[PDB]
Structure formats: C-alpha cells, structure tokens
C-alpha cells in the first residue's frame, strides 16, 4: 500500500486515476486548485465516491501555479504520512486556434500550466523522495509529442513536448537516487487565441474553415467506444508492477496515431546513446 | 536574390550563416540584441567581413525578448525592402545542471529565449509574408529533440523540443498561405542553476561527479574535425533550392546521435496522419 499524490485530479484522467488507485487499496491524495470555489463540486463528487466505496481517497488543495500552495500541500502529506511513494504529474490544460493568433504571453501561460507546474511540484517533493532513496514518478504525457497530430494546438503541443523531454531527463538524473520513472502516453479520447483580429484574418483568408475541418476530421478517427478509463487502468497496473520492473512508457491510444512507434524509436536511440557514452546505469534506477 | 532576416546572429551558426548567405549574393539582415554595448565587437567583426568581401550583409538591432524591439526592426526591413523572403529563427541559449536545481523561473526564462522569441518575431513578420503569399521559414532546431541526448540540460532541451513542435505546426498552418518551411537539425559541435544549495546536494550525493562525467563522455564522441560551417552551408543550399522543392528537415550531425532516424520516423507518422484525415494538402505549400 503506497502513498500517492496526483496533481490536477478534479476530473478527467486525473480523477479516474485517483479513484482506481484508491480502489486498489492505496492511500491517494487527489489534489486540485480552489477546492472551496471552482472545484467545490468536484470535491463533493470525489468525496462521495470515496465514502461510498470505503477507500482511502483524500482531496487536497494544491494550486500548481503557486509555489506557496505546492509547498504547503507537500508539507501536509509528509507531516501526515512521512513520505510520498508515487508522484503523478497530471495537471494540464489545452487550447485551439492558429498559432500566430496566440500571444507570446499565452504560450508562456501554457508552459506555466503544463510544465512549470511539474517543476514546482518536483522541487517540493523530490527532496523527500531522494531521502527515501526510493519512489516512482509517473508523468501523463501525450501521444502528440511523437505521433501524428492536428494543427491548431501549438501552444499546448509545445508545452507537452517540453514536458516529455523533461520527464526523460529526470528519469536519468534521479536513477542513481533509486527513483523510478514511468511515462503514460494517452492518445485522443479549452482556451482560444487572445488576438481575435489575427484569428479573424485566418478565418477570412486561405485557412477559412480549417479550424472546424480539423475538429471534425480528428474527432472522426476516435473509436466511439474508446474509454478514458483505459488510462486509469494502465496506471493501476504500473503502480502494481514490482519495483524495478516498471515499463518506461505505456501507450494508451485507441486512435492509433503512431506515438507507440515514434516513442519506441526515440526511446531506443536515447538508450543507445547512454550505452555509447558509458552511462547505461542511468537507464536503470539503483 | 532574397531578402533574409536571421535572429541571434552575433556569433555561432547565426553569424556564419549570415555571412555564407551574403556570400551567395543575398541581402542579409543579421540581427542581434544590444549592438551598442554587449555585441559592439560582434557588429565590428561582421561589418569588417561584409566590407572586405563586398557583400550585402547588414546588422540590425533586434532584441527578441522585446516585442517593441522586434516590431521596430521588422518595420525597418519592410520600409527599406518591401518584404522578407526568408525568416531564419536562430536566437537561442543553453544551460547545464541537475534539473531539480533550476528554478521554475529559470525554465520560464529559457522558454522565453528559445521559444517566445520566435513567436514575437513571427507575429511581427508573418503578416507581411502572408500578404506576399510566398516566403520561407527556416528554424534551427536541435538533434536533441529526437536523438540520443545527455542529461543535465533539461530547461534547454525542453525549450528546444517545444520549439520544434511549434515549427511543425506553423509549417501546416502557413502552407495554404504559400509559405514554405525548412527545419535545420544540428547535432553536437551557458548558464547554471540558481539553486546552489540544491545543486550542492546533487554533487555530494549519488550523482557526485555526474556533471563532469557527462561533459567528458559527450565531448569525446564529437569528431575533432567537425566544423560548424557545415550548418551554414546546408542553409545556403536550402535557400538556393527551387521553391516548392525544399527539404522539410536537414540533418547536420557529425556525432550521429540518431536524430536523423528519429525525425524521419516522426515526420513519416505525422504525414501519415494528415493523409489519413484528408488534410494532406497541408504537407505542401500552395
């Protein structure tokens, strides 16, 4: 029985994952921003599930955009439980529109939400996990960072691509500390540009209709019975695998956009390089 | 003879590329920050080359971290020449150290320099290129976004990974406007963490010596005669290729870290997806 923290768990993969892990008997902290306001109903929904099923599912206020918020929440868990066994980076947020119409700040904000968030959380949690010389980081990545993708989500896909690159780096840099990494790669199963005038130029020029054309074409390739719970069940299986035998990436992509193939080539090239330079021990947590 | 703007051209690939393009007879704006202070010598070096060789190489103040700076510089070129035929995104900056020891702001700053920079420049330049219905964006990407890589450069590799994802998106989103894209993928041929205490923990724990071990192991695989001018010559060749027949990516990687293989798989999967959804026209500028 593990102590687990998941970020951005108000709904989506985050929430089903927190519930499935708690179903598997773990002590699960399902964290999220603004539990008194914006997420009050989600808190109620999750709390009701936890009591109805008699599982150790707890909700925790954790705003990943605030270091002070993050620090407080990590201190609560450590003061209560002594450690974190599994850290699940899931907080995220996407957008749609012509990249040119998104402002520089918009891209920055996206980075904040999808990447800087993980760094705040890691900088808070990692000191404790490093003292244990043991632990598992799970990152919810995205098939888009190495598979076929639609146009019109650039600030989002950029941030996710950076997030996966960072996950990979930590995997190596934490391995001598005994910390394991597993990256979940979900396929296809939300803001817009602030520059309305620029977007209107796109709509009246050669890209007229492209936005809707993209949404429809990409919706159409998702199997109608594709279920987001597949991701939660992949995660319960990772957590339930013996230490040292966890997969590095798990692909859950009913639309089969190819990230399984892309990443398995990238993963192979990256390992090849570490063998080549005499650093193959970084491929395997101590 | 083309009108060309290159960012971050004070030295490095940027500078040799500006000189080679000017050698090929183009009108080249080699832009950079702070030409009166920090880059005054670089300005002198470049200006001396231009007069000695009698080439149309011009230096231009352009601070990619300032929208006002960017706008001014683009207005100067357009007021002088009427258009930009080739836009070369090259401004960049790297760092080395354990990812945990870099602060959230540090990662943000890196993103600013390596990604938000291109967005400021694109938002300024693209309206003009779109009116022409013609033009070429060249991005200087990095073998690290799809090849074997060292640990200890996470904020940098993250930013470059996002930058490549963005380049790919613009390639599709600009194609109906007639704008071509080519991405240069240079292999191996500089700040540090602000959190000294955290870095000192890494140095005294299980990652003792890893920093130097990485620098030495990765230096050793670069062929001693690998020359950075290979990149400049690849770019002159792209620019000199007929419109509509430019390669999408050009790999220049003497250490052979595998990004050629990684990207050619990713490129294939991405095209496959656009054919699959009926958007294959996005693969080919109008």
From TrEMBL, chains A, B:
<protein>
    <submittedName>
        <fullName>3-oxoacyl-[acyl-carrier-protein] reductase</fullName>
        <ecNumber>1.1.1.100</ecNumber>
    </submittedName>
</protein>
<dbReference type="InterPro" id="IPR002347">
    <property type="entry name" value="SDR_fam"/>
</dbReference>
<dbReference type="InterPro" id="IPR057326">
    <property type="entry name" value="KR_dom"/>
</dbReference>
<dbReference type="InterPro" id="IPR051911">
    <property type="entry name" value="SDR_oxidoreductase"/>
</dbReference>
<feature type="domain" description="Ketoreductase">
    <location>
        <begin position="2"/>
        <end position="189"/>
    </location>
</feature>
<dbReference type="InterPro" id="IPR036291">
    <property type="entry name" value="NAD(P)-bd_dom_sf"/>
</dbReference>
<keyword id="KW-0560">Oxidoreductase</keyword>
<dbReference type="GO" id="GO:0004316">
    <property type="term" value="F:3-oxoacyl-[acyl-carrier-protein] reductase (NADPH) activity"/>
</dbReference>
<keyword id="KW-0614">Plasmid</keyword>
<dbReference type="Pfam" id="PF00106">
    <property type="entry name" value="adh_short"/>
</dbReference>
<comment type="similarity">
    <text>Belongs to the short-chain dehydrogenases/reductases (SDR) family.</text>
</comment>
